[PDB]
């Protein structure tokens, strides 16, 4: 594919806890909207997730499409229940690279919206913001929590429509899906915890083999020790690397999938808010504009002229608003088709997971079978 990038060098920006690490990002992309086929940008995260939130409010006001999260920091000791930094030290940075690769693929997926060239030049250049990216100003979400009371009394008048009759099956379906995937997330991470004492238990078994194989001269047993401890460690590292990396990656996949679900909840909540905007707009239009109109025999036709201009231009823009809401419903449905395509993509990620699972399991496992049976003809 035309997107050929490379992200290396987790360079730290000094001492602290969960603030900033620089990324050597080399981009060799085709498709000449990318400038000159050879760029190498140094980008620090927890700075352009604020750019992503500018993108978030931007597509709130105009109904565009953003890509997967450019996951930030302030996560190891805050907001996560919990996160570890020795496992992060290169590997969760590789998880940032995975979320950024999905970011790159789906920012290519909206190519006309990819041609908002300001943010593309923001990504492919270096003008990096300062270190003030740790604050709390979520008062917009506070006002959403305030307006939730009006949502709870208007939701029936929302439900009288027809597009949500096409949509609400997906709502209840994704509700039972999110319940059963948050439960499966929890039990998967319970196995991720389980395997650690599994590995310590079997490693101390191999150590106790090495212990209790002393004080004896049955030297075939000594070779059995020296072969069994290391093949136990092979099995240990094998199911250990599987048991962490793919489980916690599928967990991050479902986690920012839930994030995508929450932001599309908020997307048709914004559609709801603009719905009631034109709703009470036309309501107050009819009421106060006919109250202006009914006083015509008080002989001042200028009030009639301004009331006519009010009803005319105001109904034109309100009708414009609701069929543009039909338009944004259609582009939401095309985005719905797009994320069933990424349902196919991450189901394909589990498919290629079991593909490499059967592959490396069979080749490594049967490889030391066919390499350790000819020494176990009769040597232990």
- Token output for 63: 């109904």
C-alpha span between 264 and 206 (Å, rounded): 51
Q: At what angle do helices 220-293 and 93-109 cross, to 10 degrees?
A: 40
Q: Can you tell me whether residue 41 is helix, strand or coil?
A: strand
Give the alpha-carbon dihedral of 129, 130, 134, 136, to 10 degrees: -70
CA angle 322, 328, 330 (to 5 degrees): 110
Burial of 172 (0-12, 13-18, 19+ CB in 10 A): exposed
Q: Catalogue the E-assigned strands of the chain.
A: 5-12, 21-27, 39-44
DSSP state of 324: H
Measure Cα distances from 338 to 114, 139, 222, 253, 370 in Å: 15, 31, 60, 16, 46
Distance of CA 285 to the CA centre of its chain: 42
**Cβ(3)–Cβ(29) below 8 Å:** yes
DSSP 3-state of 374: coil
Residue 12 CA neighbour count, 13 Å, CB half: 9
Omega prior to 82 cis, within 30 of 0: yes
CA distance 95 to 156: 42
Nearest-5° angle of CA 99, CA 269, CA 316? 120
Measured between alpha carbons, how far is 181 from 256 in angstroms, rounded to an integer?
A: 12
Both tokens of 98, joined, read 């995975």
The residues, any chain, with a CB within 8 Å of residue 353's CB and separated by 6 or more, are 246, 250
Q: How far is the CA of 318 from the CAs of 42, 53, 157, 160, in angstroms?
A: 47, 29, 18, 19
As a whole number of angstroms, the distance between CA 272 and CA 276 comes to 6
Instruction: Tally the residues of the chain.
Output: 380
**21-27 and 39-44: which strand pairing?**
antiparallel
Residue partners of 269: CB distance under 8 A and separation at least 6: 144, 151
Specify the DSSP element, H or E, that contains 259. Answer: helix 220-293
Cα–Cα distance between 261 and 248 in angstroms, integer? 19
Gaps in the chain following residue numbers (C to N > 2.5 A): none
Tokens in use for 224? 């059995």
Greatest alpha-carbon span in the chain:
122
Q: Cβ(77)–Cβ(18) under 8 Å?
A: yes
| Cα 320 to Cα 58, 128, 157, 326, distances in angstroms | 20, 40, 20, 10
Region of 63 (left: φ > 0; alpha: ψ -120 to 50; beta: rest) is left
Find the distance separating the first CA and the last CA of the chain, reported in whole Å.
50
Which residue, 87, 362, 105, is CA-closest to 248?
A: 87
Experimentally, the structure was elucidated by cryo-EM
Instruction: Enumerate residues 6+ apart whose C-beta is below 8 A from 126.
Output: 41, 42, 43
Distance separating alpha carbons of residues 336 and 326, to the nearest angstrom: 15
Sign of CA dihedral 128, 131, 132, 138: positive
- Report yes or no: 179 and 238 within 8 Å, Cβ to Cβ: no
DSSP 8-state class, residue 79:
S
What is the C-alpha R_g of the chain? 30
CA–CA separation, 4 and 108 (whole Å): 12
Write phi, then psi, for 325 (nearest 5 degrees).
-75, -30
The residues that bridge with 24 in the sheet, in sequence order, are 8, 42
**Which of 49, 147, 53 has its CA nearest to residue 99?**
49
Which structure tokens are listed for 268?
Answer: 């048709």
């Amino acid at each position: 594919f035309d997107l050929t990038v490379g992200i290396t060098d987790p360079e730290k920006i000094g001492d602290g806890m969960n603030a900033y690490v620089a990324y050597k990002v080399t981009t060799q992309t085709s498709l000449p909207m990318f400038r000159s086929r050879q760029f190498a940008v140094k980008r620090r995260f927890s700075d352009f997730l604020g750019l992503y939130e500018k993108l978030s409010e931007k597509h709130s006001q105009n109904g565009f499409i953003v890509p997967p999260p450019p996951e930030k920091s302030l996560i190891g000791m805050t907001k996560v229940k919990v996160g570890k930094e020795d496992s992060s030290s290169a590997e969760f940075l590789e998880k940032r690279r995975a979320a950024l690769e999905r970011y790159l693929q789906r920012i290519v997926n909206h190519p006309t919206m990819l041609q908002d060239p300001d943010v593309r030049e923001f990504l492919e250049k270096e003008e990096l913001p300062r270190a003030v990216g740790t604050q709390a100003l979520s008062g917009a979400g506070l006002l959403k929590m305030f307006n939730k009371a009006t949502d709870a009394v208007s939701k029936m008048t929302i439900k009288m429509n027809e597009s949500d009759i096409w949509f609400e099956e997906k709502l209840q379906e994704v509700e039972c899906e999110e319940q059963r995937l948050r439960k499966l997330h929890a039990v998967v991470e319970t196995l991720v915890n389980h395997r650690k004492e599994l590995a310590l238990n079997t490693a101390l078994f191999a150590k106790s083999l090495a212990m209790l194989g002393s004080s004896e001269d049955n030297t075939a047993l000594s070779r059995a020790l020296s072969q069994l401890a290391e093949v136990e460690e092979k099995i240990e590292q094998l199911h250990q690397e599987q048991a962490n990396n793919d489980f916690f990656l599928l967990a991050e996949l479902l986690s920012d999938y839930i994030r995508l679900l929450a932001i599309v909840r908020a997307a048709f909540d914004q559609r709801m808010k603009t719905w009631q905007r034109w709703q009470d707009a036309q309501a107050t239009l009819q009421k106060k504009r006919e109250s202006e109109a009914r006083l015509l025999w008080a002989n001042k036709p200028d009030k009639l002229q301004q009331a006519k201009d009010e009803i005319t231009e105001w109904e034109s823009r309100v009708t414009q608003y609701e069929r543009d809401f039909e338009r944004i419903s259609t582009v939401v449905r095309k985005e719905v088709t797009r994320f069933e395509k990424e349902k196919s993509k991450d189901f394909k990620n589990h498919v290629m997971k079991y593909l490499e699972t059967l592959l490396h399991s069979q080749q490594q496992l049967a490889k030391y079978w066919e390499a350790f049976l000819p020494e176990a003809k009769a040597i232990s």
